[PDB]
């Protein structure tokens, strides 16, 4: 089950 | 990029017995970047029905793939895996040794 | 003991034409269960183990939406890092990401991971405490400042200690017939004459699961590494693994040598000896 939030480098 | 050369193993899924259907495997690992060309050869000629695993990588970020085909070993037929990658000045051929 | 869920993401820029190549794979332990490939026809998260196919359409719609959003995140990241590293648009570059969770022998949370590489080197990694980052260089330091200010570690802790463990446990129960089955190595030894004076003994471990194994040679009950050779663990293609170790020995002295096999599927380690 993939993580649902957005994290950008 | 940091580049790493592929490791290569050529082997059958099951013990090779002449006339008994089997799988020929070419396992490439330890390489970076991911773009790679892999053929399985029969008597020096490219085999058409070859599939491969989905790209994954190890803890050190290096890539691995399995290339494979169904085959039936015979006494006379020779098999090999032919690999090219940006790290190789020419394609690397590794012969199937049935004892390895 | 231990089980793990891990996702592996590779995004490769294509300066010649078009969008990055993006490939995502999910594993439980050493079993791949899902894939996405930006170049495949489906544009869907796809099953790669039968037991995941019992998830219903809401599951596949949600994993497809997330994996497509992941692909866009890593496309952006390629551009961001090209900028941070002052690189031209002429070359192909690679962003890799892995994240997931382990559960221990007690079936509770053991470990979380969320870490990246750029062109095959460490970029940034969540430390074991899930509180702080390891930034390999001043580019990753830039990400680290951003991520500290936005409390990214705290947000990931909730997924890693929570959702990740709950879904791993759900998979392990619905794939239980295979995921909680250990396949002990099928072992034998072969003998090959090198000269009139010496021979190779080869210790085989075949069709085992999971991949973790140890093969060791002893001579007269002491570890021997001199005059030994092995191969890295390799997939059989059917979900199991193979390995061998060999020792060169004086002809007639084969009986001095023992091959020791350690694997989760063996209640006690096996000892093999050329007696047959
Ligand atoms: Ca080349």
TrEMBL record, chain C:
Location of the protein in the cell: Cell membrane; Membrane
Principal location class: membrane
Disulfide partners: 101-164, 203-259
Entry GO CC: early endosome membrane; ER to Golgi transport vesicle membrane; Golgi membrane; lumenal side of endoplasmic reticulum membrane; MHC class I protein complex; phagocytic vesicle membrane; recycling endosome membrane
Record GO biological process: antigen processing and presentation of peptide antigen via MHC class I
Keyword Repressor appears in the UniProt entry: no
Domain Ig-like: 185-271
Membrane topology recorded in Swiss-Prot or TrEMBL: Single-pass membrane protein; Single-pass type I membrane protein
Keywords: Disulfide bond, Glycoprotein, Immunity, Membrane, MHC I, Phosphoprotein, Signal, Transmembrane, Transmembrane helix
Similarity-based family: Belongs to the MHC class I family.
The name this protein goes by in its record: MHC class I antigen
Species whose genome carries this gene: Homo sapiens
Span within the parent record: 25 to 300 of 337
């Amino acid at each position: 089950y993939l993580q649902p939030r957005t994290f950008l480098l | 990029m940091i580049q790493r050369t592929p490791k290569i193993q050529v082997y059958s899924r099951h013990p090779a017995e002449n006339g008994k259907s089997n799988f020929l495997n070419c396992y490439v690992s330890g390489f970076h970047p991911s773009d790679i060309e892999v053929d399985l050869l029969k008597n020096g000629e490219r085999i058409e029905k070859v599939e491969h695993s989905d790209l994954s990588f190890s803890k050190d970020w290096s890539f691995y793939l399995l290339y494979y085909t169904e085959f039936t070993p015979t006494e006379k037929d020779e098999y090999a895996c032919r690999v090219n990658h940006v790290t190789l000045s020419q394609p690397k051929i590794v012969k199937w040794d049935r004892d390895m | 003991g231990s089980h793990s869920m891990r996702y592996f993401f590779t995004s490769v820029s294509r300066p010649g034409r078009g969008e990055p190549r993006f490939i995502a794979v999910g594993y439980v332990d050493d079993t791949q269960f899902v894939r996405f490939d930006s170049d495949a026809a489906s544009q869907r998260m796809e099953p790669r183990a039968p037991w995941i196919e019992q998830e219903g359409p809401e599951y596949w719609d949600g994993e497809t939406r997330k994996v497509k959003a992941h692909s866009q995140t890593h496309r952006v990241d390629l551009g961001t890092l090209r900028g941070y590293y002052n690189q031209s648009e002429a070359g192909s570059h690679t962003v890799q990401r892995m994240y997931g969770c382990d559960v221990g022998s007690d079936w509770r949370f053991l470990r979380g991971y969320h870490q990246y590489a750029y062109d095959g080197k460490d970029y940034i990694a969540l430390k074991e405490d899930l509180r702080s980052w390891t930034a390999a260089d001043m580019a990753a330091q830039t990400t680290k400042h951003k991520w500290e200010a936005a409390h990214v570690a705290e947000q990931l802790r909730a997924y890693l200690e929570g959702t990740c463990v709950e879904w791993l446990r759900r998979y392990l129960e619905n794939g239980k017939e295979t995921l909680q089955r250990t396949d002990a190595p099928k072992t034998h030894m072969t003998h090959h004459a090198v000269s009139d004076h010496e021979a190779t003994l080869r210790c085989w471990a075949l069709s085992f699961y999971p991949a973790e194994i140890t093969l060791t040679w002893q001579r007269d009950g002491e570890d021997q590494t001199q005059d030994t050779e092995l191969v890295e663990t390799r997939p059989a293609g059917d979900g199991t693994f193979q390995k061998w170790a060999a020792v060169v020995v004086p002809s007639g002295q084969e009986q001095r040598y023992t091959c020791h096999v350690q694997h989760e599927g063996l209640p006690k380690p096996l000892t093999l000896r050329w007696e047959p």
